[PDB]
Amino acid sequence: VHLTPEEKSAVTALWGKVNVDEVGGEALGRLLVVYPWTQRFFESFGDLSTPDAVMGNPKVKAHGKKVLGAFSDGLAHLDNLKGTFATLSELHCDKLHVDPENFRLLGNVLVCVLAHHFGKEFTPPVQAAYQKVVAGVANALAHKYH
Amino acid sequence: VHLTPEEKSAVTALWGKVNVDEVGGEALGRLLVVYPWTQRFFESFGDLSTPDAVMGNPKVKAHGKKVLGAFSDGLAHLDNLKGTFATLSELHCDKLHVDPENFRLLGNVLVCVLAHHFGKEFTPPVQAAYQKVVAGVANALAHKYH
Amino acid sequence: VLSPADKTNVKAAWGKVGAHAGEYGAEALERMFLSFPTTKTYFPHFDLSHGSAQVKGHGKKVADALTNAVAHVDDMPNALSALSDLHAHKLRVDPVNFKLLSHCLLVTLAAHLPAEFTPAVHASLDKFLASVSTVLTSKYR
Amino acid sequence: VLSPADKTNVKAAWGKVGAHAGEYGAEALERMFLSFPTTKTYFPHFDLSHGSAQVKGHGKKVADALTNAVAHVDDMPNALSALSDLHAHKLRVDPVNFKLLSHCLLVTLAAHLPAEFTPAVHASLDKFLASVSTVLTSKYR
Ligand code: HEM
Ligand code: HEM
Ligand code: HEM
Ligand code: HEM
Ligand SMILES: CC(C)(Oc1ccc(CC(=O)Nc2cccc(NC(=O)Cc3ccc(OC(C)(C)C(=O)O)cc3)c2)cc1)C(=O)O
Ligand SMILES: CC(C)(Oc1ccc(CC(=O)Nc2cccc(NC(=O)Cc3ccc(OC(C)(C)C(=O)O)cc3)c2)cc1)C(=O)O
């Protein structure tokens, strides 16, 4: 995606303060709590009956870190997101059958988590930069769908 | 946008049978009737209270003809919709203040008009090719928004 | 809300569909799968080929639920209660997909009812499909 | 449908917003204009620069309407009927934009309510905002 050099530094600067495993578990857990239909892919994770069961579920936490770890590595290739996520795009379409709308929902939940985590440091310009990134990653993951 | 040989042939062959004047008036009129809030950009067009008033409105017919006419030019440049609609994109943003979501609505209403007009000839594969084209034109027109 | 004029337009258009409802339901599904490929992610267990009997069978169930909804326009939430539970708690189809199927149903009706699909009927049918969509997603969360 | 637990969660979170409702409303608008530039098409008659009187004033009007909705959460259609008519007949804002402002309001509350923005409260506020958006677009056609 096209990010001005200032938007890139804003994204990178804040990201260096992120505990990837922690924010990953938080984002995926909130996704499953706020938009419960996303729980359709996670029946094998066990107990997802209540908000506390979802947030404390060790399998939700483990998947959250796997998902956020790949997002984090993608931040180093902001100029080539489509090529960086091509194989993951094919996997999500052909084997996992994940509706791409889910990526957009996760991206918005991640923005809310970053705002909750950083408070006033998550300024309107910093949010705008992150919005372009999550939209870029969502588009990259949906590009190989057919 | 990227279309397969058969999809490009399907779009081009059907368009050769489209009377831009009549189809344009139908599409714009139906947009104004089915999604009434789109009337906010046409207060100077006259009587738009009843379906019959909108469809017989000569200014609605004249404008529909202009819109589909520009739409036609884009079919001749499917490989470069963004370069083709750059000036019109700026106009719609800076002078007209038209929310790009309106371009999506018009594209879907146009697909309904083509199906209404052509019947069984507007097959599922033909509709799929047209959906790609209308999404591409909508994206080209929203490209210069800031 | 559906006005008396909207309800009359919907019952008139659906009446004309008649016994062809199931065939139109299958066509609408085929249009959706081709035009919006992401919707195929909810049917990995189906053969989605043109002429597939699984799509024709599903088209008939979707069309029957719609017929049931037209017959109970004044009482849709209760008429479609088992279907809302099913989509909200088991199928879990993201809400955006209902707009894609509704559009394809509209395109199918336009392609088959040239005289009936007037601008007024088009507006009423679109309102009706958004109300059915609203009911089917009312229990999502 | 907002459950009793949702209404309890919304009232608690909003009570905390309190006197900052106006400044949080202004911040949510500014976040929307920057993140979703197409929303500026509805405000060409406004000075949209940071801190303008028009944005702070409008932000205050949006927050008051939201406080009114929280105070009458059991009867929202009636509480917001004048606002519903205004958006359907005069403003005519495309429905998609309500999702954009709702997301920016949610981000603003998250950034200002560290202790209260739990997963359950986050789900309740999101549902509340979707309900308000539904009432405000109920009379569009
Ligand atoms: C920023 C967004 C996302 C990224 C970068 C991402 C990344 C990944 C990665 C790296 C894997 C492992 C692939 C492998 O085993 O080779 C994976 C698996 C998977 N993802 Fe995604 N993902 C994202 C969003 C989503 C969302 C929102 C859902 C659905 C709500 C989802 C559902 C799944 C499922 C079900 C698996 C399989 C898990 C397993 O077999 O253990 N993903 N994803
Ligand atoms: C398929 C996409 C569209 C194309 C190709 C298109 C094309 C055009 C063109 C060529 C003009 C004529 C400008 C001139 O005469 O100098 C124009 C004007 C205009 N368009 Fe678009 N347009 C499209 C969609 C829309 C939509 C959906 C809306 C709003 C519902 C809209 C609202 C307007 C308005 C308000 C004007 C000015 C009319 C006037 O002169 O009063 N357009 N457009
Ligand atoms: C007009 C809106 C819709 C109606 C009236 C409708 C109705 C139905 C009905 C009647 C069933 C069959 C339940 C049974 O076996 O008794 C069903 C199943 C199903 N629906 Fe929906 N549906 C709608 C929209 C959607 C959408 C938008 C999708 C996804 C793109 C979807 C995906 C499914 C799936 C996957 C099944 C299960 C099919 C199977 O495994 O046999 N539905 N729906
Ligand atoms: C949470 C949802 C929303 C609420 C509670 C809300 C509330 C209000 C209120 C209270 C007014 C002031 C009316 C008056 O002065 O009497 C208003 C005006 C207005 N709203 Fe909405 N609104 C919402 C969403 C939207 C959206 C999404 C947009 C567009 C992106 C929008 C655009 C406008 C415009 C342009 C005005 C006129 C402002 C002016 O010229 O003074 N609104 N709204
Ligand atoms: C996974 C997928 C498919 O996700 C999408 C898909 C589509 C979209 C946008 C889309 O194409 N929209 C669309 C497509 C086809 C038809 C329509 N039609 C409308 O939504 C009509 C409409 C508009 C506003 C309405 O609002 C009111 C208040 C009147 C109401 O709901 O009653 C009602 C109906 C809309 C965004 C993300 C993707 O990544 O490609
Ligand atoms: C003009 C504009 C802005 O056009 C579009 C087109 C598509 C879209 C799609 C979009 O971005 N969606 C979006 C964006 C930001 C936040 C959210 N959040 C949600 O929609 C949350 C949500 C999801 C499903 C919901 O469904 C249920 C059934 C629960 C409900 O409605 O209550 C409710 C809320 C959604 C946006 C703009 C453009 O061209 O950029």
Side-chain angles (χ1 to χ4, degrees):
Chain A
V1 186
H2 177 258
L3 270 74
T4 57
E6 44 267 30
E7 286 182 312
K8 292 192 189 75
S9 302
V11 167
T12 316
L14 197 79
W15 197 257
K17 303 187 193 176
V18 170
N19 176 324
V20 181
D21 279 6
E22 173 199 288
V23 169
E26 245 282 323
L28 192 63
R30 282 186 190 243
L31 174 69
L32 303 183
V33 171
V34 184
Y35 304 108
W37 54 96
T38 60
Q39 294 176 20
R40 75 190 105 125
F41 309 100
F42 309 104
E43 306 183 281
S44 67
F45 286 19
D47 194 19
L48 299 179
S49 63
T50 65
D52 285 327
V54 179
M55 303 307 292
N57 187 299
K59 285 191 174 191
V60 167
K61 289 170 179 297
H63 190 59
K65 46 164 291 205
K66 187 184 292 186
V67 164
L68 248 261
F71 177 92
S72 189
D73 295 340
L75 255 41
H77 300 103
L78 250 23
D79 292 314
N80 181 44
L81 288 172
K82 288 206 296 285
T84 297
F85 291 99
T87 308
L88 272 178
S89 178
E90 296 181 48
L91 181 71
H92 284 78
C93 176
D94 294 342
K95 299 300 179 58
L96 309 174
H97 318 292
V98 176
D99 178 353
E101 187 55 31
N102 289 295
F103 309 142
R104 165 150 43 278
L105 287 176
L106 178 52
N108 290 329
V109 171
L110 180 56
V111 170
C112 291
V113 164
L114 293 182
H116 186 232
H117 192 67
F118 290 107
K120 71 179 219 301
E121 296 162 82
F122 197 70
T123 62
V126 169
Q127 168 184 358
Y130 271 88
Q131 293 286 171
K132 288 182 193 175
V133 169
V134 300
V137 173
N139 283 164
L141 278 168
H143 96 284
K144 293 310 200 68
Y145 277 64
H146 60 101
Chain B
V1 292
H2 172 261
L3 264 66
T4 65
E6 66 128 58
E7 291 189 316
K8 219 185 84 70
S9 295
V11 169
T12 289
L14 191 85
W15 204 255
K17 309 175 62 166
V18 171
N19 179 292
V20 170
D21 297 5
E22 279 183 45
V23 168
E26 266 291 297
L28 188 64
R30 284 185 186 245
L31 177 76
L32 271 25
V33 171
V34 181
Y35 304 106
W37 58 94
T38 62
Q39 290 173 22
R40 77 195 303 284
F41 303 109
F42 308 104
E43 302 285 355
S44 62
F45 278 24
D47 195 16
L48 300 180
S49 317
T50 63
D52 296 82
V54 176
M55 304 308 290
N57 190 309
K59 292 182 190 192
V60 167
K61 296 187 180 169
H63 195 55
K65 178 188 167 70
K66 281 179 185 178
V67 169
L68 239 72
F71 185 89
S72 293
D73 296 341
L75 292 191
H77 302 95
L78 286 166
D79 291 308
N80 219 315
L81 294 175
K82 290 178 197 309
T84 299
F85 291 103
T87 304
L88 287 181
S89 178
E90 291 171 48
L91 178 69
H92 283 78
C93 176
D94 305 331
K95 283 203 176 183
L96 309 172
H97 313 302
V98 177
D99 182 348
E101 175 64 15
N102 286 294
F103 304 138
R104 289 195 175 70
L105 292 176
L106 177 59
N108 289 328
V109 166
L110 177 63
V111 167
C112 288
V113 167
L114 294 179
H116 181 231
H117 187 90
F118 294 102
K120 70 168 179 287
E121 190 183 345
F122 194 68
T123 57
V126 172
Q127 169 187 353
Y130 269 94
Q131 296 284 173
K132 291 189 183 174
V133 174
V134 297
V137 169
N139 281 334
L141 272 163
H143 186 253
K144 285 297 181 181
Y145 280 65
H146 56 92
Chain C
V1 313
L2 297 177
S3 64
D6 289 323
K7 297 172 194 156
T8 300
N9 286 333
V10 174
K11 293 176 186 293
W14 210 252
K16 196 66 233 304
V17 167
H20 296 120
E23 181 197 323
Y24 295 171
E27 183 179 320
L29 289 170
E30 188 182 348
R31 290 182 181 276
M32 184 189 57
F33 298 138
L34 294 181
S35 296
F36 309 108
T38 57
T39 60
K40 296 192 297 184
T41 59
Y42 296 98
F43 297 87
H45 56 294
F46 268 44
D47 175 355
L48 301 172
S49 299
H50 172 250
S52 173
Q54 297 181 300
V55 174
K56 196 182 305 169
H58 192 55
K60 168 69 178 167
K61 288 175 184 177
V62 170
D64 286 345
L66 259 6
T67 294
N68 178 38
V70 172
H72 294 87
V73 265
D74 297 292
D75 195 56
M76 281 192 276
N78 182 64
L80 301 176
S81 197
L83 254 52
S84 301
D85 289 340
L86 181 63
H87 289 78
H89 311 302
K90 188 211 163 199
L91 308 172
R92 289 148 145 172
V93 178
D94 190 284
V96 306
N97 300 282
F98 289 87
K99 285 180 176 310
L100 306 182
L101 183 54
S102 295
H103 172 62
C104 292
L105 228 7
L106 233 36
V107 173
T108 299
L109 294 183
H112 289 269
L113 311 171
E116 287 76 14
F117 203 71
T118 60
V121 170
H122 179 175
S124 295
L125 287 167
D126 201 41
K127 286 182 63 173
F128 172 70
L129 297 174
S131 303
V132 168
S133 297
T134 295
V135 174
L136 293 184
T137 53
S138 59
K139 308 295 190 183
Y140 269 47
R141 67 183 177 165
Chain D
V1 184
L2 288 175
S3 66
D6 289 322
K7 304 172 191 191
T8 294
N9 286 337
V10 174
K11 288 178 184 294
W14 205 261
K16 222 307 188 77
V17 163
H20 299 288
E23 80 180 73
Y24 291 2
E27 179 179 330
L29 294 168
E30 177 169 328
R31 290 177 178 282
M32 183 184 66
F33 294 141
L34 293 180
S35 290
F36 308 101
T38 61
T39 61
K40 294 189 294 185
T41 61
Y42 295 96
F43 302 85
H45 59 300
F46 264 33
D47 172 21
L48 297 179
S49 54
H50 177 81
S52 85
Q54 281 155 318
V55 174
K56 290 185 189 177
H58 193 243
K60 175 180 180 49
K61 289 179 192 168
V62 172
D64 283 12
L66 257 29
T67 301
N68 175 42
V70 171
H72 302 274
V73 71
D74 292 317
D75 189 34
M76 281 199 266
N78 258 121
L80 306 177
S81 60
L83 229 37
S84 191
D85 291 314
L86 178 62
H87 291 76
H89 307 316
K90 300 192 179 302
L91 302 177
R92 293 118 121 195
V93 171
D94 188 277
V96 76
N97 299 280
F98 291 86
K99 281 178 182 306
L100 306 181
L101 178 56
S102 293
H103 171 65
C104 294
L105 251 325
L106 216 53
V107 171
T108 300
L109 296 174
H112 286 275
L113 304 178
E116 300 77 10
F117 203 75
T118 58
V121 170
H122 177 172
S124 293
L125 288 169
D126 197 44
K127 286 180 65 172
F128 167 69
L129 294 177
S131 293
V132 164
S133 299
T134 292
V135 170
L136 290 179
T137 56
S138 65
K139 302 178 184 176
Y140 269 52
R141 56 178 189 173

